[PDB]
Design a protein around this nucleic acid. Structure first.
Ligand SMILES: [Mg+2]
Ligand SMILES: [Mg+2]
Ligand SMILES: [Mg+2]
Ligand SMILES: [Mg+2]
Ligand SMILES: [Mg+2]
Ligand SMILES: [Mg+2]
Ligand SMILES: [Mg+2]
Ligand SMILES: [Mg+2]
Ligand SMILES: [Mg+2]
Ligand SMILES: [Mg+2]
Ligand SMILES: [Mg+2]
Ligand SMILES: [Mg+2]
Ligand SMILES: [Mg+2]
Ligand SMILES: [Mg+2]
Ligand SMILES: [Mg+2]
Ligand SMILES: [Mg+2]
Ligand SMILES: [Mg+2]
Ligand SMILES: [Mg+2]
Ligand SMILES: [Mg+2]
Ligand SMILES: [Mg+2]
Ligand SMILES: [Mg+2]
Ligand SMILES: [Mg+2]
Ligand SMILES: [Mg+2]
Ligand SMILES: [Mg+2]
Ligand SMILES: [Mg+2]
Ligand SMILES: [Mg+2]
Ligand SMILES: [Mg+2]
Ligand SMILES: [Mg+2]
Lengths: 85, 80, 82, 122
RNA sequence: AAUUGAAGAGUUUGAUCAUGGCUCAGAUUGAACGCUGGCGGCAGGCCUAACACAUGCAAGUCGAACGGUAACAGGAAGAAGCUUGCUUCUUUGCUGACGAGUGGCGGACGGGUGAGUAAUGUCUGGGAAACUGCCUGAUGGAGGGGGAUAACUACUGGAAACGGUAGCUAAUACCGCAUAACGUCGCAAGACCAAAGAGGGGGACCUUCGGGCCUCUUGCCAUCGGAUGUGCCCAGAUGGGAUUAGCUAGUAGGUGGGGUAACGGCUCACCUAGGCGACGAUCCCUAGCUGGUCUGAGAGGAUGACCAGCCACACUGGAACUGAGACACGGUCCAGACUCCUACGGGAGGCAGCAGUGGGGAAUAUUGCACAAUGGGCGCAAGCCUGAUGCAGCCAUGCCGCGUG
RNA sequence: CCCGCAGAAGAAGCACCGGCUAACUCCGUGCCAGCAGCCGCGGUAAUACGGAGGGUGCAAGCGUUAAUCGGAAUUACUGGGCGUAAAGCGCACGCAGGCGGUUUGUUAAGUCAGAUGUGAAAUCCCCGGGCUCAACCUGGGAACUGCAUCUGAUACUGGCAA
């Protein structure tokens, strides 16, 4: 409403869409992992982890999941896979 | 220990869901007589070991549950 | 960031500031961390008019506090050692 | 296509929720009201602090009906229910200030211009 | 030196003593009314309808991030007003500057209110599992690329709000790629993550005369600290009622998955059958809590304006997005209630910010001045903004002083 | 804030006067008009109504109303009562609860002691300081009677034992 930082409104949408896509693509690669664990495939399970690890670590750096959120995911996944891998 | 609490058991009958009674005396803030103000606490005790009637020593840990912020330390006495 | 500044506990037309260390975001006369001096600008030439526990001010500026503009003057106006 | 005994919904903030038509105005022996005609109604039920109480008797203009409206090409606009807008007795003119649901252009009636100005649709 | 301070009277009786209510002298007030009314200093000023609101103002700032010229200011090869040094327009963003736009930081502060809340609250005292913008210590970073886009141009729809096509372009916008430890996962071996430039002045030397180069400043990335802010857990205390005695299925606990910055029935699946309760649960009624304020010799009683702390709310219900921080007081979205605009097709708005208005009431102020001070936002700065604030206006409303001899 | 200028020049009101309660007479009125916090005044001499003279009390205020506490030991913890004045349940048995003879040992929760931390600033209070005084402003103390932690003391109370 009439006050300069209308700008801010339209700004936070540009932001919102940006983060929306990277935020999904990320949880996809995360999904691909839990998929293999439910399957049984230890290799695809590691294969999945090794391609998602960078993009999590990476997203965090960029700052839509800042720090430990990544950690937990790695930690969790790692346990799971070699729980029976 | 940074402080500890004693108290009798009161309820053992639940997979580690141990609850302990604590008893203080306190001067009535108005009529000076001393009365019994009781406190019940929900304490953790891995591999269930205390029993109804046991005196027990207890300490304040972080939240183990919505209810539990205390584990036990030692036991004292039984078969009341 | 924390800051050293003048709270104005004066009295219409005869100001008398407390000098305080506080979260710069708070109100000029609101919540503060500790008091570290005072500054009567109507001191009168009689006696006192700008007492100022330096060795604390010190401490906080060590811990990262900025100083006002007025206060900065007072410190460099107390002189410092004499 | 409304007549005596017909219940109607209300398309305004009048406070009336359910009304009954006790008269079809506009001509001796005249049976139906529809389109955008004026009817006399009684109030069967109303909200607790409205502009009108239950039991009140006044007029209203029908603005929505199951039977609808034909247009000069053959088409029809049909509504799922019958709705009217309450008017004051010695003036027609709407008692309410807001209108709800769509209305038809048939209301182009002068005295009902406020009703088109307000109101969401058609 | 520093709470060292306590009084009674009237009235049942013909009279009496007792019992016992009523009344009175005292302090106190954000007060009102009636009569009266001189001046000043400090203070106080919608207690009611968390009723509804016309209009102005209450949050911006940075050209030292970016392409930039539309306004007005100058200057300019050169075209000129010509009254031959005083100077006019074509233009040219050349720099002083600067509407609009991108970007940055602030719009989570400051200011309002007391609705909800008997506890995600508050007060006291503690605890462990966390994040923390600006500011600050330490240690190294800061390579090399890429595709966009607003502005603008053209075309075009609307009364307006504001749009549709197609191009076109810069960066501290954006994304890869490198680099990767005292960081993250991992017992290890290993694997994995980042960034941005912008100014100021300057000797050779010289360059495509823009600059490299030197040099200092400022911003940018990473890790560990500080400082502050905030999240969370426990205990005790913090109104009333039994003409409310039973309450409870995510309910209580466990195991695992998931989740959060973090512990956790936070969530789920499965198991155990628990958990609370007369030391008052549940239900109902009322209520923001504190410091303190008034009174009282005290103990108490009463109270929570003005000042400061915490919480909570921002038309009503609900939501999340952005962000270090919000489920956002002058942000967004949905529903609702209600109001305004209109060319009738569609749009817009929320004073419990300041002033002001209607309404309610026994009753509560000016649509003022200024950033000079202090304090806050942004900027290297100069500065710009700041109804915070500092002042002024109104009322004997109070305190204090003074006068009317 | 300072100096000059004129001329007492512009500047007093409100409640009360029966007792409680400081302050008294006259006229009018006549259970009327009316007053009133409580008692209670008014029917022919009204210090109680209304007016007047006088007086008492406060003063740019004064009265009235509303409101909290006080006096009220009238919810009595400090600090009260129940034969006849308000008040012993018609009587009993008894769960919970409260209380509990006497001895030794032990415990250290109640209790007591010390130390440490904390109890925001303002406010209150004491001693000062600054506005011509005062209100107001300010330095510094004192106080916040509280809470927690640690270590001790064991008479009393609580726990355990006999
Ligand atoms: Mg887990
Ligand atoms: Mg008598
Ligand atoms: Mg008057
Ligand atoms: Mg600009
Ligand atoms: Mg309320
Ligand atoms: Mg960037
Ligand atoms: Mg890399
Ligand atoms: Mg680059
Ligand atoms: Mg779990
Ligand atoms: Mg007393
Ligand atoms: Mg206020
Ligand atoms: Mg909301
Ligand atoms: Mg976020
Ligand atoms: Mg507003
Ligand atoms: Mg206003
Ligand atoms: Mg009125
Ligand atoms: Mg103001
Ligand atoms: Mg006398
Ligand atoms: Mg009288
Ligand atoms: Mg007489
Ligand atoms: Mg009493
Ligand atoms: Mg008695
Ligand atoms: Mg009796
Ligand atoms: Mg008897
Ligand atoms: Mg004995
Ligand atoms: Mg204090
Ligand atoms: Mg003096
Ligand atoms: Mg003993």
């Amino acid at each position: 409403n009439i006050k300069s930082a209308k700008k801010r409104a339209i700004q936070s949408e540009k932001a919102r869409k940006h983060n929306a896509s990277r935020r999904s693509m990320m949880r996809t690669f995360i999904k691909k992992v839990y998929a293999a664990i439910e399957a049984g495939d230890k290799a695809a399970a590691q294969k999945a982890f090794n391609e998602m690890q960078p993009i999590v670590d990476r997203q965090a750096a960029k700052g839509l999941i800042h720090k430990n959120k990544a950690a937990r995911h790695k930690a969790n996944l790692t346990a799971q896979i070699n729980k029976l891998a | 220990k940074i402080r500890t609490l004693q108290g009798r058991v009161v309820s053992d009958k639940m997979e580690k869901s141990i609850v302990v009674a604590i008893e203080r005396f306190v001067k009535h803030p108005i009529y000076g007589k001393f009365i019994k103000r009781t406190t019940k606490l929900h304490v953790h005790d891995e591999n269930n070991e205390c029993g109804i009637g046991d005196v027990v020593e207890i300490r304040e840990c972080r939240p183990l549950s919505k209810t539990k912020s205390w584990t036990l330390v030692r036991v004292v006495e039984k078969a009341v | 960031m924390v800051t050293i500044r003048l709270a104005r506990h004066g009295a219409k037309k005869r100001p008398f500031y407390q000098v305080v260390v506080a979260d710069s975001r708070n109100a000029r006369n609101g919540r503060f961390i500790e008091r570290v001096g005072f500054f009567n600008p109507i001191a009168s030439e009689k006696e006192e008019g700008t007492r100022l526990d330096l060795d604390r001010i010190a401490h906080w500026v060590g811990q990262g506090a900025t100083i006002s503009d007025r206060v900065a003057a007072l410190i460099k106006e107390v002189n410092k050692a004499a | 296509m409304i007549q005596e005994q017909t219940m109607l919904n209300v398309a305004d903030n009048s406070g009336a929720r359910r009304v009954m038509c006790i008269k079809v105005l506009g001509g001796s022996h005249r049976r139906y009201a529809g389109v955008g005609d004026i009817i006399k109604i009684t109030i069967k039920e109303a909200i607790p602090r409205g502009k009108v109480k239950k039991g009140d008797v006044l007029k209203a203009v029908v603005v929505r009906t199951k039977k609808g409206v034909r247009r000069p090409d053959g088409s029809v606009i049909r509504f799922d229910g019958n709705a009217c807008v309450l008017l004051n007795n010695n003036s027609e003119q709407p008692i309410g200030t807001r209108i709800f649901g769509p209305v038809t252009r048939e209301l182009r009636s002068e005295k009902f211009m406020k009703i088109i100005s307000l109101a969401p649709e058609v």
